[PDB]
Amino acid sequence: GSMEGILDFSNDLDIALLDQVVSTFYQGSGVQQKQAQEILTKFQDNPDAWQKADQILQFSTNPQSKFIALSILDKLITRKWKLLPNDHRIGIRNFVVGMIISMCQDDEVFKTQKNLINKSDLTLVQILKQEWPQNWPEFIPELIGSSSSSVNVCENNMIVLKLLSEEVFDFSAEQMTQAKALHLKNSMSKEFEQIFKLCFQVLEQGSSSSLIVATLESLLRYLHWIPYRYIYETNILELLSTKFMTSPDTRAITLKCLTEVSNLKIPQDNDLIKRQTVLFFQNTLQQIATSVMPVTADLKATYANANGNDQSFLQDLAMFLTTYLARNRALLESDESLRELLLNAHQYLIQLSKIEERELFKTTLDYWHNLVADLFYEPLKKHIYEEICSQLRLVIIENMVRPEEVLVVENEIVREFVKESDTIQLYKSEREVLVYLTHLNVIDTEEIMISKLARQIDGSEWSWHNINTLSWAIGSISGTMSEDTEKRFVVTVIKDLLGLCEQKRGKDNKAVVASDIMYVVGQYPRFLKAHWNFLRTVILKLFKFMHETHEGVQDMACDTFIKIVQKCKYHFVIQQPRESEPFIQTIIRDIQKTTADLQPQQVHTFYKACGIIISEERSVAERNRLLSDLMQLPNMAWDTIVEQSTANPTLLLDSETVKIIANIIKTNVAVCTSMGADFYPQLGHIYYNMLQLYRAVSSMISAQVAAEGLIATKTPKVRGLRTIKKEILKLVETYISKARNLDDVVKVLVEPLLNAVLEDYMNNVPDARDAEVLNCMTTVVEKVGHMIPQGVILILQSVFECTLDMINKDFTEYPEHRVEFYKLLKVINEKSFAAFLELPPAAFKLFVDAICWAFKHNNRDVEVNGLQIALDLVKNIERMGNVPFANEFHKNYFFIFVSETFFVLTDSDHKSGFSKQALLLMKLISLVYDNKISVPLYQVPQGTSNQVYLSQYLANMLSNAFPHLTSEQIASFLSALTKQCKDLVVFKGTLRDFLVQIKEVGGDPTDYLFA
Template identity: 35%
Template sequence: MAEALRDLSKPIDVPLLDATVAAFYGTGSSEERHAADQILRDLQNHPDMWLQVVHILQNSQNLNTKFFALQVLENVIKYKWNVLPVEQRDGIKNYISEVIVQLSSNEASFRQERLYVNKLNIILVQLDVLLKFFPVAAYRNLTLQCLTEVAALHFGDFYNMQYVKMYTVFMLQLQAILPSGTIPDAYANGSNEEQAFIQNLALFFTSFFKNHMRTLEATPENRAALLLGIEYLIGISFVDDTEIFKVCLDYWNLFVLELFEAYNQMERTTAKMVGLQAQMVQGTVDGTLTAVQQRRQLYSGPLSKLRTLMICRMAKPEEVLIVEDENGNIVRETMKDNDVLVQYKIMRETLIYLSHLDHEDTEQQKLSMQLSGEDWSWNNLNTLCWAIGSISGSMVEEQENRFLVMVIRDLLNLCEITKGKDNKAVIASNIMYVVGQYPRFLRAHWKFLKTVVNKLFEFMHEMHPGVQDMACDTFLKIVQKCKRKFVTLQVGENEPFVSELLSNLPATIADLEPHQIHTFYESVGQMIQAESDNTKREDYLKRLMSLPNQKWAEIIGEASRSIDILKSQDVIRSVLNILQTNTSAASSLGPHFFPQISQIFLDMLTVYRMYSELVSSTISEGGPFASKTSFVKLLRSVKRESLKLIETFVDKAEDLPHLGKQFVPPMMDPVLGDYARNVPDARESEVLSLFATIINKYKGEMLEEVPRIFEAVFQCTLEMITKNFEDYPEHRLKFFSLLRAIGTHCFQALIQLSSQQLKLVMDSISWAFRHTERNIAETGLSLLLEILKNFEASGFHNQFYKTYFLTIEQEIFAVLTDTFHKPGFKLHVAVLQHLFYVVDGLTEPLWDASTTPSQYTSNAMFVRDYTIKLLSSSFPNMTPVEVAKFVDGLFSSKADLSNFKNHIRDFLVQSKEFSAQDNKDLYAEEAAALQEKEHQRMLSIPGLIAPNELQDEMVDS
């Protein structure tokens, strides 16, 4: 036997080797074990034995034999691996890699061979395979990520420790071959294979740290290897590759969040302990605090580098409108990049946590050379300012003030000393972004606020693409947060800023486009709205509107002499621009806009009537295609803007309903009558939304007007929208919004309808909630629920339910069990609960006594049978017992909405109709609750929700 095994000129006899190994580990005589030991020693020392390793591993079923072969391989690796031919080394590495992947591919094989896999993993590290196998095309995508994931799922503490040992060995090898500081350059100058290796390193480190960081933290020697690995990952994060950075960023976000939450919890615990004298509790808390502080100290160096990383790589926020194109030119952004916005959100959140962990270090990351111009570049300044803006609210006010004084002064100075339009445009956009993110600072520093706003006025004359838009948007954002400052007489000023602004208004807006002027008027309207003195406010409003009013008076004056002047396209555009300017101011001023709208209202209705008649005659003469001409579109734009202006004022004038209501009677014929008389293509959907707003605002006071509204819009609109689900999309939602307003606030008007008219209303509601457009279906369901509740409280409920109960139930179950209507689940449940709840209180039988047997003694008994038959036909795969159990559950849970909802949801999920679908819509309420909980968590962390996303204006300091 010994001689047969020692002849290695041919493939070794694996069964014979298995027997020898078994003899060595067996229970035989000492002579047999000694003989086997001698054979194995001779084989292990044979210079050609390593050539048999793959053959043994492939053919042996004995784990001890495989370990013997791997021991042979380890000796070769240790003493003469580098002198072996490359093809032989690659062959062994590839084979071991294949075996690991194969055995780790499913849980069963892994569990069975886990000791063998573990040994192979160690061999992989010893082979330096992570650094050398990437040029082999078949294994470029192989990393230790799969191994660490398997370890996290299946290995206990012992195996975690083994992986930590492997990791420390790997780090020693990696450090010798690829120093961490060289990674960005190595990637930039590397081959495809070398770049792929660095990409896989990112995957390895992030996966390994997620699963083993706590184990690495446990001992000093492992901590050193851990910090070294973090250094490598930070270096990889600086690599100029978006996909690699995303991998690293996702991990850094989790890492920093975990550290912050522990630190935040420590601070809350400390606060709770103030005043407590319980020594044992205090000792426990002290131990926890020490552990948290030690971890924070352990990572202080890497965290500082992470702050630098976030600043250097900060993504562009949504508010920044100018970008560098592929030719290196500064242009206005034409399309939002959603990937960049998502990346900004993650980076901003990460930097907020980093700021809370060490505010001082965050402040020191300001890169003064960049702001002084010594390290000037567009990208460097952009990312720095985006980062500065992103941490607004995370510092205490005193520190934030000190920080911002320096930043804004340096930016303004940089703008003064820098030459070149593109350079100035970049600096301007950054100034506007930063100041727009710090309303608290601006409110507390009037001189800075005034300087910033005047600088924005300068930028409004800058013709570089995007600068004017951003100046107007930033002005609006600042005014929304600081409006009281502009109407208050500040120390050292002769008049409130708003008065000074209004005096210079023509010059300030001289170079702005119409849409920018509208934003400007909305901003100034915000200021005027903050003025509490009625006389001053009306004077400011008059001065603000003097320019558009002057132009309006000229047009109306000329029209009084020759009506044809209103047909000029230039005049139509002027009218449209004036109305849009009024709408912008009205949106800010609300009820305080009354003096202005009163001044132009009747003339506006006259223009509306004339343009409407012109549209109708043009379409009548030219046919459907006439509605697509630029002339008709322009006329209709004026009509729409007129309606929008009235709706905006009514919507904002809720505190003074008598002001808005007086505008309703004059509109009845010019607006409602025009809608009824017009051809369908000339009917403005804004008429429907305007009267929905009016009814929602004035509620029961509009009851007398509802019949006329109903007569003017109901039948003709239904004829437009019920032919299919596509035509007149704007009319659809607005029609049902109007119907909902009537059903909610003027329900008495529905009761007064004839049975034919009420049936038409109910049919239209059913048509709405069967609609595949989510907003329309939701509006129809909400309207149905309102009507059901109102009929329940009226004296007509028996008659109503006798007519519509079964139809409504059938229709609701149809959409409830249709996967296209899953977003309506919450309202479906609410309607069904209402039906099942009211059925016991109905005194009229719901069945037809002339066709239905008289075995029913109650409506509940009848509805139970009816529902079982209805659902049995819809779900033939379910047994009658299952259906009956579900229906009985509806009756037993009808008094508890939560249980009722869960019962229906369980039924849908268990049915075959829904089992293979994405059912997140069925859990939308729970998801919303989680979102609200997350929102509250974010509110509790200063800066995590940006100050400009909070309420418009906090109390001025």
């Protein structure tokens, strides 16, 4: 309605109308809320709204209105303070101070308007950052003094000090210049002796919990930076570790304080400070045992119940114990009078480790890793923790998370859908600790596992969960036992797991136990390599599971097969005793039967595993014969499908034919992936007809686009035809990236390839171009680019301009072409730079445009390569020396790269590339200050050094782009920046100082003398 009236500043501000807009926004809904929101934003953003701030704080009845008024002052203080006349600055200060004093002395306002007082405190801290201590050196004395006049004021002064400490020490790195951060840090350091007095007095005095909690909250911040003596040379550790642990109001913050105290590294040679570090830990653990919970308490149940703040307290306790013990447990390990304290602390951690809470388990597990790694190396330590470690073996074995390989899950035992990567890292961490624990006592670990197993056979503890967690634990400790103990151990586990399969014979049953046996056996290849008779049986059993109707078991059997093959492949190529032929022979002969019930993706994995085996045969003649045997089925289907495609080239209309072709190529891709350079004979068998097929399917796609429109590219038919092209490109890329005979690559493969792919890419409409063409060409250039200078030129001509036109209208369309495009330019620039030298001057300008275009992407893939291309290009030009092309390059493009780099450095939208942007800028600047540009960069009096002109160019560029800077700021900045162009670290700090200063008015130019 008339809510917009408050946006008009001709008249005075209708405070009541303002409060209605605010209430409509916070308490409203729907369209009125949405309109009030826009109005309030416009109101806040008005460069004069700050003048209305004090009359809103005087006459408003809505605390949110006053909050928004303070946000308006904050914006003014942090960005425009030094542009205000000095009188407006004192008025704002006095008003903010008075409003704070006024709100504290009204005991009712102090209770109910907490947010509004916190916001005012923060606003006051913003004024301190600008004015303190140089223009207010009595703030801290007056704050200390005023703390006695009232309890509410004293409590609120702790909030102000807390916020100041945060703004100066914790959050200054990004918000202030180096010089100003150091100024305020030194200023607080110089006056902290007094602050600590007030803080320690309040803590010893002890008014009520409100003022104590606020004082401790501030102390937590101080502990980030204050000298050690304030903590160890006073009585404050006794207070923290006893007094304030007893009351639950102060226990949470005190524990966080003691955690911070713990994390410092003590002077490791003074006995007193050591005894004090022991003492506050001893006090803290005693207070927990007597006031909160004894060491026997069931923390798992307490956490699950989640009364009050129990969950946060247990989290904080875990953090305190792990933090302190990782730093200081050695202090407790020698003195026998401290052994109970040491073990009790670790017993609390054992209990914390049973809580059901993944993130909390990771925190304790991190600590256990720290401990067991230390007991694995440090002499004479592991016996101390024997009973702890024994309990920990149980905790980890019973809480193993499902490994990647186990594809069966319950929801009814069915098949996985997703990749749980939050669980991937967790499993790795559980495995690491359990492996260490097994090394520390291999007998205890076996006894736990064998007994738990013995109670699965009995059905005494049977369940999905118990057999699974146990099986995963058993698999995860592979490699910790000696071959002999492992031998006896695995035998026992397998025998007992087989017996269990016969007993729990439902279909869910058998799928659980099948997955567990597959996991275990897949984890013990060393055992398989030494027991061929068992290995053969396992493989045949996996082949049988390839016909399982349960899709999870079936898929897992294929993964276990290739996983075993990767480790045991050598035992499949040799002729074993008692065997009529290498087992690879037996696998190949029955491959159609074995894989008949598998999905195509699973068939390809099978073929890939056969390729791993075949590559172990180093007799070339025998290997190639294995290769042709393996490829018998796809090559026969290929020979059939190509004789029937050459004659009447229309049978490719058949969707069933297109699917058959794609699976043939996918099979070749699979085998090529594992055989690499050894694949070449098979590639040669299909290569010519495969590129002819590429051309034929290309004509079909173009014909369909012409007859049906661009929408044809979405149809199942055209998508299937493009799959053929993409897989062909993938096969050629896969081989070339592993090829060892590059002469054959150049003389046999490259020319037919380019003839088949480049013009087709160039002359298709954009929506029909395959970005995989670019990816294939990147590999070609990477591996043989140096041998095909004319082929690289041909690649550029065919794909450069037409791809650029696809991606230079926005940052979003054709995202895959975008990424592959700049990967291609990158490799060409670094391996065949000559191709860019032969470019026509107009096309070389598009190349520069293309690089700078990459700069402005937010997509990290494009941005990083763009910055790298620019840096490699500059290097490429510098390497040419003093010749016309280099000289013309600098004249035409040097200042384009400097200004484009500066633009992305300063626009606040490309923070992620700061490091590379700075590197590129430092290189560019260093070119001039090393006189490595042998031509004037200008068109200015003659004889001027390029150094002088660069400073003039940059000063003028910055003056016009950031007109709120003074001439002296710009000049000081450039002076510091140019002097530092050989010291990347300091150079970067100076750029960061500049990015701070451009966000405010009145920045001090001497800040750039910091280094």
